[PDB]
Amino acid sequence: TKPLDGINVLDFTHVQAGPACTQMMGFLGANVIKIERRGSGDMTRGWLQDKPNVDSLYFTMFNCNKRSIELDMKTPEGKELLEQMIKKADVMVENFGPGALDRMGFTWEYIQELNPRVILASVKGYAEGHANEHLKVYENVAQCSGGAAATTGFWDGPPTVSGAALGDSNSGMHLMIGILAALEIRHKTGRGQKVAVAMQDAVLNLVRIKLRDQQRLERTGILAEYPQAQPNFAFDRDGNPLSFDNITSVPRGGNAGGAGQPGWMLKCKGWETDADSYVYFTIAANMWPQICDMIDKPEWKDDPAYNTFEGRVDKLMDIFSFIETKFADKDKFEVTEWAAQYGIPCGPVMSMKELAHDPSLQKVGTVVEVVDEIRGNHLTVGAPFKFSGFQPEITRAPLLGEHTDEVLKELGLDDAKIKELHAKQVV
Amino acid sequence: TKPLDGINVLDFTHVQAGPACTQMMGFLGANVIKIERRGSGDMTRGWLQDKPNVDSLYFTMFNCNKRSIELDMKTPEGKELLEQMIKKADVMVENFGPGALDRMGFTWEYIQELNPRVILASVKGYAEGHANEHLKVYENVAQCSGGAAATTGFWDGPPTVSGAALGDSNSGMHLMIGILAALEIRHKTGRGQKVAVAMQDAVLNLVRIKLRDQQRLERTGILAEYPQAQPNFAFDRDGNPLSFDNITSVPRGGNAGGAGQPGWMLKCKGWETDADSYVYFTIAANMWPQICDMIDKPEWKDDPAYNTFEGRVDKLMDIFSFIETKFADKDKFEVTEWAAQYGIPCGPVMSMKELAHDPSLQKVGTVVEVVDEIRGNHLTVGAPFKFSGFQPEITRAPLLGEHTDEVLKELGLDDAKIKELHAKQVV
């Protein structure tokens, strides 16, 4: 038995955020029926295909454990089918624009009338009631809207986007929390709920630490752990040392440690030609002696200039650069193991190639080979939560309208009605 | 009614990942009892305080809607107290080191004997069964382990950490999904489960899109939407040109679209002296005519060199630089407003200062002013999921051991025993 066995999900979602949510629900046992536009369907199907006339990897990696029906929802017949489907659903999920589901004929008030137990779940750009509730938002726009871009990158570069989907997949996971929370409401009340996640808000939630930093900056005028607060560290375009004298909003700190121990991203052997030949190295106070041992600077063990956190505050970047010189002829895994034998936590930058072929990730079900007999097998990311009672059974993504007639039969339609719907181009 | 009304959480968590999970459960109505170390408590209390001997903003922004008890869990009396608390709990949450809770005497097996209904939830660094399962992992190392660092930043710079807590807060939110899924299944089985999220896996889930790219790269040798696909655009530090001829693992693409739909980070008025004076601008293929009107380039609408994704691959960055010239005398808000007239996906890089003081975010309850008459009021991030039937009631973070005696009384202890435990320094 899996957690969402028996949960019927009516899934209107397309692209990334909504589809990630309903896929993960599918991995935990949900019965997900993906409603798609006739002819073309989810636009990710035709997005950067590696095989001619085959659904893309963008589509397959976000739409496993789902069935597909085609439907023209602007038809009277299409709306009637929708009503029948809503009556059999536990959860409806959508990411249409602001007011779009209302405009296609399905307000929250009407949905409740159709099914007093259904949960309506929406992904939005900005929250309902926001001044900017009307704006379109995509992945990187949300990263910008939510404070991540402003605080990611370097002090002498632009605002920078994360390769991680802070906007789309993250908002999807947030909506899954909302949906699951609404299921627990329903166990208590016996009735459904409307739930919504704004992409800005899902981003902001992960940037909570930078809102801590903004308040600290306003209250005290300084962030002591940031590069800009330390001598001989950060400089601008024209070589002047930076400082918090003139900084009133949380700045970019490059690869600085932040809310943890002071750290930096250090080059290992081959960095000129291997973009991922790096480790992240941290200087914990109470490791200082074993660091001195590792890098053979015994003189630094006794010297008050280097001996303490206070002493190192004017030379931390120079200390990182020196440690880096010791990694110049060593590989990133070599350095990690070297650090470990001194009790020093250190970690390599994993390339996507390394991750795609790592045996450990495949052993634990985090990287999974999906059996796809139509398209050829592909890798995906599985469930990042591991459970004592079960594991996901990941099955291939659906062809466009693959399950249209099968779903119609489940609604109770006979052959005659089904053929008429095809005739009238409703499905 | 609140989703987690009547749910009792025994909360061992400290620092960021675990506390974020339990705070958000508290926001949704859970009764959270936070077990803390005697004297010092959660180490975030004393980290980067903005006011002497006042619990830090790191602590207060991660520990609202919790009660605090001090406990020496090493003592025989402390352990039997834990036994009584476990029998009353629905969820136990921990982020101690590998095997630490086991070695305290509280294996999953023993926990099941104490309470068949209780759910055990853990934050780990690497998944159980992983080669690295024994390692402790911190924020930026987790970002490196999960593919985020490798795919974030620029092609001529280093792997770059995100300002977003992709390791800590992200893992906590994923753990919350795991906990709620376990509650949902307990309604069917009547039994608790063990659930775990690893930091590497939480990061990898958000980097799903980069695993698509790796497979595309291995299969085809080209990622056509990446900057390096534009001939003679990207170079390394030595001025050597970059292209997919010699790229075998997913590279950093600067401010490229990722999950979009191509886009870039474009300067607005004041960029020279304002780090966040930028917008993100997306060239969605279906909106090229609208874009041409906005930037007064009608000749680009019918030109095969400009009017498709394929035509623009060799010149996309030249188009971005031209669009940017149109924003030279407009601030980011006026540019966003202008683009929105055309329906073009485009928005500002919001500064943390701007987010901290934004009226819209406070209206919708995503930025919340917490009433704290002991410490003074502070801002925090509220629930990023909004519900039709309830709103969170956020209450100030507990003082160290504030609720110790209160919690002991609930366990049925008399005043004599409570006095004895204080005298023995168990509490």
Side-chain angles (χ1 to χ4, degrees), chain A residues 96-136:
Chain A
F96 298 117
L101 195 53
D102 295 341
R103 289 195 305 277
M104 44 207 284
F106 296 89
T107 62
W108 170 233
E109 288 66 34
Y110 188 56
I111 288 163
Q112 281 178 106
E113 184 183 336
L114 294 174
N115 189 349
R117 294 187 37 87
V118 73
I119 292 148
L120 169 63
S122 300
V123 181
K124 298 167 182 302
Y126 286 84
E128 187 172 330
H130 204 289
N132 287 334
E133 186 191 332
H134 59 94
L135 294 181
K136 289 191 198 176

Short mmCIF file of all heavy atoms in Angstrom, two decimals, chain A residues 96-136:
data_model
loop_
_atom_site.label_atom_id
_atom_site.label_comp_id
_atom_site.label_asym_id
_atom_site.label_seq_id
_atom_site.Cartn_x
_atom_site.Cartn_y
_atom_site.Cartn_z
N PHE A 96 -3.20 27.47 -14.98
CA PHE A 96 -3.64 28.43 -15.99
C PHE A 96 -3.41 29.85 -15.44
O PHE A 96 -3.16 30.03 -14.25
CB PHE A 96 -5.12 28.25 -16.34
CG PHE A 96 -5.47 26.89 -16.93
CD1 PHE A 96 -6.34 26.03 -16.26
CD2 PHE A 96 -4.97 26.50 -18.16
CE1 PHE A 96 -6.70 24.79 -16.81
CE2 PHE A 96 -5.32 25.26 -18.72
CZ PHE A 96 -6.19 24.40 -18.04
N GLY A 97 -3.52 30.86 -16.29
CA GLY A 97 -3.34 32.25 -15.84
C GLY A 97 -4.34 32.70 -14.77
O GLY A 97 -5.23 31.95 -14.38
N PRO A 98 -4.18 33.94 -14.27
CA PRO A 98 -5.15 34.48 -13.32
C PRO A 98 -6.58 34.56 -13.89
O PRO A 98 -6.80 35.14 -14.95
CB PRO A 98 -4.60 35.87 -12.97
CG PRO A 98 -3.55 36.17 -13.97
CD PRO A 98 -3.07 34.87 -14.55
N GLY A 99 -7.51 33.94 -13.18
CA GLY A 99 -8.92 33.91 -13.56
C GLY A 99 -9.27 32.99 -14.71
O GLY A 99 -10.43 32.92 -15.10
N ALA A 100 -8.28 32.29 -15.26
CA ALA A 100 -8.50 31.48 -16.46
C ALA A 100 -9.47 30.31 -16.23
O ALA A 100 -10.36 30.09 -17.05
CB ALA A 100 -7.18 30.98 -17.01
N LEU A 101 -9.31 29.57 -15.12
CA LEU A 101 -10.23 28.47 -14.79
C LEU A 101 -11.66 29.00 -14.55
O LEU A 101 -12.63 28.37 -14.94
CB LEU A 101 -9.75 27.66 -13.58
CG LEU A 101 -10.42 26.28 -13.36
CD1 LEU A 101 -10.37 25.41 -14.61
CD2 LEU A 101 -9.77 25.56 -12.19
N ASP A 102 -11.77 30.16 -13.90
CA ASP A 102 -13.07 30.83 -13.75
C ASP A 102 -13.69 31.08 -15.13
O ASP A 102 -14.86 30.79 -15.35
CB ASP A 102 -12.95 32.19 -13.04
CG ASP A 102 -12.47 32.09 -11.60
OD1 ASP A 102 -12.56 31.00 -10.99
OD2 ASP A 102 -12.01 33.13 -11.07
N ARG A 103 -12.89 31.63 -16.04
CA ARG A 103 -13.35 31.97 -17.40
C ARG A 103 -13.75 30.74 -18.23
O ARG A 103 -14.67 30.82 -19.04
CB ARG A 103 -12.30 32.81 -18.14
CG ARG A 103 -12.18 34.24 -17.62
CD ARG A 103 -11.42 35.15 -18.56
NE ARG A 103 -10.09 34.66 -18.91
CZ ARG A 103 -8.99 34.81 -18.17
NH1 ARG A 103 -9.02 35.46 -17.01
NH2 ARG A 103 -7.84 34.30 -18.60
N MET A 104 -13.08 29.61 -18.04
CA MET A 104 -13.50 28.38 -18.74
C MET A 104 -14.73 27.71 -18.09
O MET A 104 -15.20 26.68 -18.56
CB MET A 104 -12.33 27.39 -18.97
CG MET A 104 -11.37 27.14 -17.83
SD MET A 104 -9.71 26.64 -18.41
CE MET A 104 -10.04 24.94 -18.89
N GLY A 105 -15.26 28.32 -17.04
CA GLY A 105 -16.58 27.98 -16.51
C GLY A 105 -16.57 27.28 -15.16
O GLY A 105 -17.57 26.68 -14.77
N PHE A 106 -15.45 27.38 -14.44
CA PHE A 106 -15.27 26.61 -13.22
C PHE A 106 -14.68 27.45 -12.09
O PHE A 106 -13.49 27.33 -11.75
CB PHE A 106 -14.44 25.36 -13.53
CG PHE A 106 -15.13 24.43 -14.47
CD1 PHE A 106 -14.96 24.56 -15.85
CD2 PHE A 106 -16.00 23.46 -14.00
CE1 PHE A 106 -15.63 23.71 -16.73
CE2 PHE A 106 -16.68 22.62 -14.86
CZ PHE A 106 -16.49 22.74 -16.24
N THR A 107 -15.53 28.29 -11.52
CA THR A 107 -15.19 29.01 -10.30
C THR A 107 -15.09 28.03 -9.15
O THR A 107 -15.59 26.90 -9.22
CB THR A 107 -16.24 30.07 -9.93
OG1 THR A 107 -17.49 29.42 -9.67
CG2 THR A 107 -16.41 31.10 -11.05
N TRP A 108 -14.43 28.46 -8.08
CA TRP A 108 -14.36 27.67 -6.85
C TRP A 108 -15.76 27.40 -6.28
O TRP A 108 -16.03 26.30 -5.80
CB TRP A 108 -13.47 28.40 -5.83
CG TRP A 108 -13.49 27.82 -4.45
CD1 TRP A 108 -13.74 28.50 -3.30
CD2 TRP A 108 -13.26 26.46 -4.07
NE1 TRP A 108 -13.66 27.65 -2.22
CE2 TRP A 108 -13.37 26.39 -2.67
CE3 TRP A 108 -12.96 25.29 -4.78
CZ2 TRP A 108 -13.20 25.20 -1.96
CZ3 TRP A 108 -12.79 24.11 -4.07
CH2 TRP A 108 -12.91 24.08 -2.67
N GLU A 109 -16.65 28.39 -6.37
CA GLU A 109 -18.02 28.24 -5.91
C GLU A 109 -18.75 27.12 -6.67
O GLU A 109 -19.46 26.31 -6.08
CB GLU A 109 -18.79 29.57 -6.06
CG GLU A 109 -18.37 30.67 -5.07
CD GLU A 109 -16.94 31.17 -5.26
OE1 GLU A 109 -16.46 31.22 -6.42
OE2 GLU A 109 -16.29 31.53 -4.25
N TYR A 110 -18.56 27.09 -7.99
CA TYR A 110 -19.22 26.07 -8.83
C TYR A 110 -18.59 24.68 -8.64
O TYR A 110 -19.31 23.68 -8.60
CB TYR A 110 -19.18 26.48 -10.31
CG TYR A 110 -19.99 25.57 -11.21
CD1 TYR A 110 -21.35 25.36 -10.97
CD2 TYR A 110 -19.40 24.94 -12.31
CE1 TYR A 110 -22.10 24.53 -11.80
CE2 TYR A 110 -20.15 24.12 -13.14
CZ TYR A 110 -21.49 23.91 -12.87
OH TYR A 110 -22.24 23.09 -13.69
N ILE A 111 -17.27 24.64 -8.52
CA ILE A 111 -16.56 23.38 -8.24
C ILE A 111 -17.06 22.75 -6.94
O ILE A 111 -17.32 21.56 -6.90
CB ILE A 111 -15.01 23.61 -8.21
CG1 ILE A 111 -14.49 23.85 -9.64
CG2 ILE A 111 -14.30 22.42 -7.58
CD1 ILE A 111 -13.10 24.47 -9.73
N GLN A 112 -17.22 23.56 -5.90
CA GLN A 112 -17.76 23.10 -4.61
C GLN A 112 -19.18 22.52 -4.73
O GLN A 112 -19.52 21.56 -4.04
CB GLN A 112 -17.80 24.25 -3.61
CG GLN A 112 -16.46 24.57 -2.97
CD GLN A 112 -16.56 25.75 -2.04
OE1 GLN A 112 -16.54 25.60 -0.83
NE2 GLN A 112 -16.71 26.94 -2.61
N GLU A 113 -19.99 23.15 -5.59
CA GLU A 113 -21.35 22.68 -5.87
C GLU A 113 -21.30 21.32 -6.57
O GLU A 113 -22.08 20.42 -6.24
CB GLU A 113 -22.10 23.71 -6.73
CG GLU A 113 -23.56 23.37 -7.03
CD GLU A 113 -24.24 24.38 -7.93
OE1 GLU A 113 -23.79 25.55 -7.99
OE2 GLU A 113 -25.22 24.00 -8.60
N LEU A 114 -20.38 21.15 -7.50
CA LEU A 114 -20.20 19.87 -8.19
C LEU A 114 -19.71 18.75 -7.28
O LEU A 114 -20.13 17.59 -7.41
CB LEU A 114 -19.22 20.03 -9.35
CG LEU A 114 -19.67 20.91 -10.52
CD1 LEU A 114 -18.52 21.06 -11.50
CD2 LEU A 114 -20.93 20.36 -11.21
N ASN A 115 -18.80 19.08 -6.36
CA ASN A 115 -18.18 18.08 -5.49
C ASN A 115 -17.71 18.73 -4.19
O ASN A 115 -16.70 19.43 -4.18
CB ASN A 115 -17.01 17.39 -6.20
CG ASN A 115 -16.47 16.21 -5.42
OD1 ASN A 115 -16.81 16.00 -4.25
ND2 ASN A 115 -15.63 15.42 -6.06
N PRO A 116 -18.45 18.50 -3.09
CA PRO A 116 -18.13 19.15 -1.82
C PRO A 116 -16.87 18.59 -1.15
O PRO A 116 -16.41 19.15 -0.15
CB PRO A 116 -19.37 18.85 -0.96
CG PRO A 116 -19.88 17.57 -1.50
CD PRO A 116 -19.59 17.58 -2.97
N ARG A 117 -16.31 17.52 -1.71
CA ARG A 117 -15.10 16.89 -1.17
C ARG A 117 -13.81 17.15 -1.97
O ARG A 117 -12.72 16.86 -1.47
CB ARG A 117 -15.34 15.39 -1.02
CG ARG A 117 -16.40 15.07 0.04
CD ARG A 117 -16.55 13.60 0.36
NE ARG A 117 -15.31 12.82 0.37
CZ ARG A 117 -14.48 12.68 1.40
NH1 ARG A 117 -14.72 13.26 2.59
NH2 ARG A 117 -13.39 11.93 1.25
N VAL A 118 -13.91 17.72 -3.17
CA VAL A 118 -12.73 17.92 -4.03
C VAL A 118 -11.83 19.06 -3.53
O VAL A 118 -12.31 20.06 -2.98
CB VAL A 118 -13.11 18.12 -5.53
CG1 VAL A 118 -13.74 19.49 -5.78
CG2 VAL A 118 -11.89 17.89 -6.45
N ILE A 119 -10.52 18.89 -3.71
CA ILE A 119 -9.53 19.91 -3.41
C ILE A 119 -9.05 20.56 -4.72
O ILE A 119 -8.60 19.87 -5.63
CB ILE A 119 -8.36 19.31 -2.60
CG1 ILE A 119 -8.86 18.91 -1.20
CG2 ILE A 119 -7.22 20.31 -2.47
CD1 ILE A 119 -8.15 17.72 -0.62
N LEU A 120 -9.20 21.88 -4.81
CA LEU A 120 -8.69 22.65 -5.95
C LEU A 120 -7.35 23.23 -5.58
O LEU A 120 -7.24 23.97 -4.59
CB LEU A 120 -9.66 23.78 -6.34
CG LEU A 120 -9.16 24.83 -7.34
CD1 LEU A 120 -8.83 24.20 -8.71
CD2 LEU A 120 -10.18 25.97 -7.47
N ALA A 121 -6.33 22.93 -6.39
CA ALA A 121 -4.96 23.33 -6.10
C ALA A 121 -4.38 24.07 -7.31
O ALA A 121 -4.39 23.56 -8.43
CB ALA A 121 -4.11 22.10 -5.77
N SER A 122 -3.87 25.28 -7.07
CA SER A 122 -3.39 26.14 -8.16
C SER A 122 -1.97 26.61 -7.93
O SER A 122 -1.60 26.93 -6.81
CB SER A 122 -4.29 27.39 -8.29
OG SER A 122 -5.63 27.04 -8.57
N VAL A 123 -1.18 26.64 -9.01
CA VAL A 123 0.11 27.33 -9.03
C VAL A 123 -0.13 28.70 -9.66
O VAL A 123 -0.73 28.79 -10.73
CB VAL A 123 1.16 26.58 -9.90
CG1 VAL A 123 2.50 27.31 -9.87
CG2 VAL A 123 1.33 25.14 -9.43
N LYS A 124 0.33 29.75 -8.97
CA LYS A 124 0.22 31.12 -9.46
C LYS A 124 1.62 31.75 -9.52
O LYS A 124 2.55 31.24 -8.93
CB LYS A 124 -0.66 31.94 -8.52
CG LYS A 124 -2.10 31.45 -8.41
CD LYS A 124 -2.82 32.09 -7.23
CE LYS A 124 -4.24 31.57 -7.08
NZ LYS A 124 -5.06 31.79 -8.29
N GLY A 125 1.74 32.87 -10.24
CA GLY A 125 2.98 33.66 -10.24
C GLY A 125 3.13 34.48 -8.97
O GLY A 125 4.12 34.36 -8.25
N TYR A 126 2.14 35.34 -8.73
CA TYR A 126 2.01 36.12 -7.51
C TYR A 126 0.72 35.71 -6.78
O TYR A 126 -0.23 35.25 -7.41
CB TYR A 126 1.93 37.62 -7.85
CG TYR A 126 3.25 38.24 -8.28
CD1 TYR A 126 3.69 38.16 -9.60
CD2 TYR A 126 4.04 38.93 -7.37
CE1 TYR A 126 4.89 38.76 -9.99
CE2 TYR A 126 5.24 39.52 -7.74
CZ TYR A 126 5.67 39.43 -9.05
OH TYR A 126 6.87 40.02 -9.40
N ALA A 127 0.70 35.92 -5.47
CA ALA A 127 -0.43 35.52 -4.64
C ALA A 127 -1.68 36.32 -4.99
O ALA A 127 -1.60 37.49 -5.42
CB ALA A 127 -0.08 35.68 -3.17
N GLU A 128 -2.84 35.69 -4.82
CA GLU A 128 -4.11 36.38 -4.99
C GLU A 128 -4.16 37.55 -4.01
O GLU A 128 -3.94 37.37 -2.81
CB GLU A 128 -5.29 35.43 -4.78
CG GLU A 128 -6.65 36.05 -5.11
CD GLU A 128 -7.80 35.06 -5.09
OE1 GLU A 128 -7.58 33.86 -5.38
OE2 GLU A 128 -8.94 35.48 -4.80
N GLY A 129 -4.42 38.75 -4.52
CA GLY A 129 -4.44 39.96 -3.70
C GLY A 129 -3.19 40.82 -3.83
O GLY A 129 -3.18 41.97 -3.39
N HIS A 130 -2.13 40.27 -4.43
CA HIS A 130 -0.89 41.00 -4.68
C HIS A 130 -1.18 42.11 -5.69
O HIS A 130 -2.03 41.95 -6.57
CB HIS A 130 0.19 40.04 -5.23
CG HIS A 130 1.60 40.49 -5.01
ND1 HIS A 130 2.18 41.55 -5.68
CD2 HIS A 130 2.58 39.97 -4.22
CE1 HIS A 130 3.43 41.68 -5.30
NE2 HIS A 130 3.71 40.73 -4.43
N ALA A 131 -0.47 43.23 -5.57
CA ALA A 131 -0.53 44.26 -6.60
C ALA A 131 -0.21 43.67 -7.98
O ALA A 131 -0.80 44.08 -8.98
CB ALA A 131 0.42 45.41 -6.28
N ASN A 132 0.71 42.71 -8.03
CA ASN A 132 1.16 42.08 -9.28
C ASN A 132 0.51 40.72 -9.57
O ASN A 132 1.05 39.92 -10.34
CB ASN A 132 2.70 41.95 -9.27
CG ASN A 132 3.40 43.28 -9.46
OD1 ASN A 132 2.86 44.22 -10.05
ND2 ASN A 132 4.64 43.36 -8.99
N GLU A 133 -0.67 40.48 -8.98
CA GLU A 133 -1.43 39.23 -9.17
C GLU A 133 -1.63 38.87 -10.66
O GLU A 133 -1.71 37.69 -11.02
CB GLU A 133 -2.80 39.35 -8.47
CG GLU A 133 -3.63 38.07 -8.48
CD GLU A 133 -5.07 38.26 -8.01
OE1 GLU A 133 -5.35 39.19 -7.21
OE2 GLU A 133 -5.93 37.45 -8.45
N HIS A 134 -1.69 39.90 -11.50
CA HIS A 134 -1.92 39.76 -12.94
C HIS A 134 -0.72 39.31 -13.79
O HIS A 134 -0.91 38.83 -14.91
CB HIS A 134 -2.44 41.09 -13.50
CG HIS A 134 -1.50 42.24 -13.28
ND1 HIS A 134 -0.58 42.63 -14.23
CD2 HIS A 134 -1.31 43.06 -12.22
CE1 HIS A 134 0.13 43.64 -13.77
NE2 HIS A 134 -0.30 43.93 -12.55
N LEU A 135 0.51 39.46 -13.28
CA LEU A 135 1.73 39.23 -14.09
C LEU A 135 2.01 37.76 -14.43
O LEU A 135 1.85 36.87 -13.59
CB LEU A 135 2.97 39.81 -13.39
CG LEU A 135 3.10 41.33 -13.22
CD1 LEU A 135 4.41 41.67 -12.53
CD2 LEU A 135 3.01 42.06 -14.55
N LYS A 136 2.46 37.51 -15.67
CA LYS A 136 2.95 36.19 -16.06
C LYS A 136 4.30 35.95 -15.40
O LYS A 136 5.14 36.84 -15.40
CB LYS A 136 3.16 36.09 -17.57
CG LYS A 136 1.91 36.06 -18.42
CD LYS A 136 2.29 35.69 -19.87
CE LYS A 136 1.20 36.07 -20.87
NZ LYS A 136 1.62 35.78 -22.27
#
